[PDB]
Ligand binder design. Structure first.
Ligand SMILES: CCCCCCC/C=C\CCCCCC(=O)O[C@H](COC(=O)CCCCCC)CO[C@H]1O[C@H](CO)[C@@H](O)[C@H](O[C@@H]2O[C@H](C)[C@H](N)[C@H](O)[C@H]2NC(C)=O)[C@H]1O
Ligand SMILES: *[C@@H]1O[C@H](CO)[C@@H](O[C@@H]2O[C@H](CO)[C@@H](O[C@@H]3O[C@H](CO)[C@@H](O)[C@H](O)[C@@H]3O)[C@H](O)[C@H]2NC(C)=O)[C@H](O)[C@H]1NC(C)=O
Ligand SMILES: *[C@@H]1O[C@H](CO)[C@@H](O[C@@H]2O[C@H](CO)[C@@H](O)[C@H](O)[C@H]2NC(C)=O)[C@H](O)[C@H]1NC(C)=O
Ligand SMILES: CC(=O)N[C@@H]1[C@@H](O)[C@H](O)[C@@H](CO)O[C@H]1O
Ligand SMILES: [Fe+3]
Ligand SMILES: [Zn+2]
Ligand SMILES: [Zn+2]
Length: 341
């Protein structure tokens, strides 16, 4: 009776999920929704069991009673003796990236420029940068800071969606799923790489994984790290190698969430699923790899080494931390106690 229903966001994730479902022998089956919020609703209704969420979405799900179950864990440097599944998470660096050729663009001259965001409500793409901007300008009119943007999830007829391109046909403009060309970490970075936007709000890893031949994708194969600069909060610009000293915040890792009454069951299935399809899995790269999808980051981030257990059985507030949680609450005053559904 240990069957788990995963929630896929958009048709590309659905496709990957179906493959996983086939290989799992129906231990995992798939539900699909157009947006992450819709997937959250499916979980609440008990029509789906779980999905992997960015920190920003964990906050939404948390208010509605969903709980973190396992966290994405990437390549470490320390803790190297301890196993991946037991190793603590280090969190990723949220950064703002610009073209080197775009001289004189600093943090202090971002107003009226063109911005690329992963999606509304996400940590590096929205919550961190817009929280900082709202704070600095003392205004809730974050919708009027940049001249134009691609922020998937915003009103398709607003300036916040002006730069979004939609799918292979121009349909689904600004939808918060991989159908939108400039959606997510990869899409937001592509938005910058193609000079549609002036700045991209992504995490540190995105820059590295899509430059100097790390990505064989059409738009990325010719990109060089040296051609990019990170915007620091002190008004300086640094090479992408200096992320440790030039980031906007440290973000809590993406995590699997489920309804609390299903948490234990979801955990045991997943631990077994990754033994089969994880980084060193029995059937990866032979038959299926759960953490691969050609830089598209479908279901999970492509740089995920393993899903790790969470020390101290944390609530959603403890995981994201009190630092990050307070930032979100303040930004959400612009747009204390309620589930948003
Ligand atoms: C006071 C208000 C707190 C905020 C709200 C409550 C949060 C409650 C949970 C957080 C507990 C704090 C750290 C405990 C931890 O598990 O982590 C390290 C301990 O690891 C081990 O070796 C355990 C080995 C176990 C063997 C025994 C079986 C050391 O911690 C330090 O190093 C860790 C990796 O080297 C980072 O995870 C951690 O930061 C964390 O990194 C991420 C970036 C994320 N953004 C987190 O939000 C951040 N921490 C906080 C508190 O925000 C960092 O401070
Ligand atoms: C935008 O501005 C608000 C207002 O300052 C920032 O919220 C504030 O965040 C700090 C740190 O999270 C909170 O201060 C304190 O933290 C210490 C722990 O170090 C704690 O001991 C104190 O009780 C206190 O919370 C502060 O409470 C909080 N202020 C308010 C009014 O909620 C927010 O972080 C800023 N946004 C961004 C993205 O920086
Ligand atoms: C930013 O992210 C990049 C890529 O995720 C990190 O570079 C990787 O670091 C590991 C060891 O920590 C190396 O073994 C990998 O080969 C690197 N990946 C690539 C694609 O080059 C980098 O360490 C991160 N920077 C910070 C400051 O966290
Ligand atoms: C392909 C696959 O995942 N098969 C599993 C099998 O290993 C396991 O005995 C059972 C309960 O865990 O569920 C099924
Ligand atoms: Fe994220
Ligand atoms: Zn820092
Ligand atoms: Zn606790």
């Amino acid at each position: 009776y240990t069957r788990v229903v995963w929630c896929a966001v958009g048709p590309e994730e659905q496709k990957k999920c179906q493959q996983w479902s086939q290989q799992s022998g129906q231990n995992v089956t798939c539900a699909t929704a157009s947006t992450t919020d819709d997937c959250i609703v499916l979980v609440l209704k008990g029509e789906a069991d779980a999905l992997n969420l960015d920190g920003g979405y964990i906050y939404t799900a948390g208010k509605c009673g969903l709980v973190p179950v396992l966290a994405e864990n990437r390549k470490s440097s320390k803790h190297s003796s301890l196993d991946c599944v037991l190793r603590p998470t280090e969190g990723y660096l949220a950064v703002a990236v610009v073209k080197k050729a775009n001289e004189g663009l600093t943090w202090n001259s971002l107003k009226d420029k063109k911005s690329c965001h992963t999606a509304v409500d996400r940590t590096a793409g929205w919550n961190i940068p817009m929280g900082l901007i709202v704070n600095q300008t003392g205004s809730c009119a974050f919708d009027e800071f940049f001249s134009q943007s691609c922020a998937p999830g915003a009103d398709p007829k607003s300036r916040l969606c002006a730069l979004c391109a939609g799918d292979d046909q121009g349909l689904d403009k600004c939808v918060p799923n991989s159908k939108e060309k400039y959606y997510g970490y990869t899409g937001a970075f592509r938005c910058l790489a193609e000079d549609v936007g002036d700045v991209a709000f992504v995490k540190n890893d995105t820059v590295w994984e899509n430059t100097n031949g790390e990505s064989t994708a059409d738009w990325a194969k010719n990109l060089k790290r040296e051609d990019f600069r990170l915007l620091c909060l002190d008004g300086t610009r640094k090479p992408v190698t200096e992320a440790q000293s030039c980031h906007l915040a440290v973000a809590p890792n993406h995590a699997v969430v489920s309804r609390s009454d299903r948490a234990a069951h979801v955990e045991q299935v997943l631990l077994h699923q990754q033994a089969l399809f994880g980084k060193n899995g029995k059937n990866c790269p032979d038959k299926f790899c759960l953490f691969k999808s050609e830089t598209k980051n479908l279901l999970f981030n492509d740089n995920t080494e393993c899903l790790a257990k969470l020390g101290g059985r944390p609530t959603y507030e403890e995981y994201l931390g009190t630092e990050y949680v307070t930032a979100i609450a303040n930004l959400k005053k612009c747009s204390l106690e309620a589930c948003a559904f």
